[PDB]
């Protein structure tokens, strides 16, 4: 186990389409799947999970190649990866729709599932990342404040395995810079927490898998250009940080082009890492949105 498991939750594995996925599961009731993003693992949800498990069956998988999950066998584009996550969720809720919460690249790896299987999704919560489309080609490389928040897209997508070659052996240093530069509350990350994430990402296949998601981003953009001809119909909420490192108003404004029924919130003073930076308000919003009318 790479991260401590909360009391009442089990750490387990399930093979989907030949790939062994890791997840942490607990609670009882309708299913909620929480999908982490880059620089993290299932563990970013560990404060939200015990609250949601009072009323829901909660599952938090590790993305293929990351955490303790095997790499995908098809590829790292959103449409390919979404297949694994959809089949995993259907294994635990084969007869009823489930809720989905996703963060950062969790969004990239679930959007194709959601739009293609809308009857399987009851509610949707998306936080802190763009859905891959041509809008991401407008984010600036460099800013009047210096280092931009998006330069890593091209760094990670570069050929010649640039990112692995430069970062290997220096995962702890790079991850601390990456996380803190995308944070407003930079000090919330204990030294041990950063050690645990770096240890997980320093596994050679996890370091590589990390960057393959970005090497597949242009293919994901092209996939979504076709998929987005169908708008999302289920109730949706977006969350974004209102501080340094966050998406700000972009999150809701983009989502309005993809979904009919969307509510959005910007958390002031919070950056990219909402579950850690602004745990109590974010947790409350998710629980509320998922609890409502039920």
């Amino acid at each position: 186990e790479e991260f401590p498991v909360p009391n009442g939750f089990e750490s387990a594995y399930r093979e989907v389409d030949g790939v062994k996925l890791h997840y942490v599961k607990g609670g009882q009731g309708p299913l909620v799947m929480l999908v982490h993003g880059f620089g993290q693992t299932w563990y970013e949800w560990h404060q939200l999970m015990p609250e949601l498990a009072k009323r829901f069956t909660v599952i938090a998988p590790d993305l293929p190649g990351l955490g303790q999950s095997e790499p995908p066998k098809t590829g790292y584009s959103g449409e390919q990866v979404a297949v694994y996550l959809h089949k995993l969720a259907r294994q635990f809720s084969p007869d009823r729709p489930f809720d989905l919460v996703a963060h950062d690249i969790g969004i990239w790896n679930t959007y194709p599932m959601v739009v293609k299987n809308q009857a399987d999704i009851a509610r949707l919560v998306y936080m802190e990342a763009p859905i891959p489309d041509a809008r991401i080609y407008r984010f600036p490389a460099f800013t009047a404040q210096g280092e931009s928040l998006v330069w890593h897209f091209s760094f990670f997508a570069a050929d010649d395995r640039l990112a692995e070659t430069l970062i290997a052996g220096k995962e702890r240093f790079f991850l601390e810079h990456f996380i803190k530069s995308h944070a407003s509350n930079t000090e919330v990350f204990s030294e041990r927490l950063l050690d645990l994430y770096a240890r997980s990402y320093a596994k050679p296949h996890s370091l590589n898998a990390s960057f393959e998601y970005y090497r597949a981003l242009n293919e994901s953009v092209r996939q979504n250009a076709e998929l987005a001809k169908t708008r999302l119909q289920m109730p949706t909420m977006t969350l974004a940080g209102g501080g340094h490192g966050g998406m700000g108003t972009f999150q809701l404004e983009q989502m309005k082009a993809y979904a009919e029924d969307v509510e959005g919130h910007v958390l002031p003073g919070c950056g990219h890492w909402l579950p850690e930076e602004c745990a109590a308000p974010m947790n409350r919003l998710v629980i509320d949105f998922l609890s409502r009318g039920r």
Partner: nanobody, 124 residues
């Protein structure tokens, strides 16, 4: 958050100064930041604002009275805010203050989040 301004002084018309805004307690990394000024006799008024950095970039708004002469910018390594004042005029004489808000529009409307610091005197 406890705000500390510095960099003021006495300068001749056409001269230049750079003001610094820092937090002696807390952090304004998560908030838009702005400069305000107050001349003796007047109330405090908005000068310039700069947003936080988002994935889409950032935004600034500069009051028409100093547009083309003053610029505002941030250092995200120090978590500080600066006012670069070029082409100073006598009518720029005032005490200059920084404060924050959730967005630059709020600063443009005179709103702010924290207790005012001592300010810094600029005499032209």
């Amino acid at each position: 958050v406890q705000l500390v301004e510095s960099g003021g002084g006495l300068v001749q018309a056409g001269g230049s100064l750079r003001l610094t805004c820092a937090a002696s307690a807390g952090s304004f990394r998560g908030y838009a930041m702005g400069w305000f000024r107050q001349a003796p006799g007047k109330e405090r008024e908005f000068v310039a604002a700069v947003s936080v950095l988002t994935w889409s970039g950032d935004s600034t708004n500069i009051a028409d009275s100093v547009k083309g002469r003053f610029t505002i910018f941030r250092d995200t390594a120090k978590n500080t805010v600066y006012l670069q004042m070029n082409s100073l005029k006598p009518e720029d004489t005032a005490v200059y203050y920084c404060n924050g808000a959730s967005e630059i529009g709020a600063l443009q409307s005179g709103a702010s989040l924290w207790s005012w610091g001592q300010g810094t005197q600029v005499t032209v």
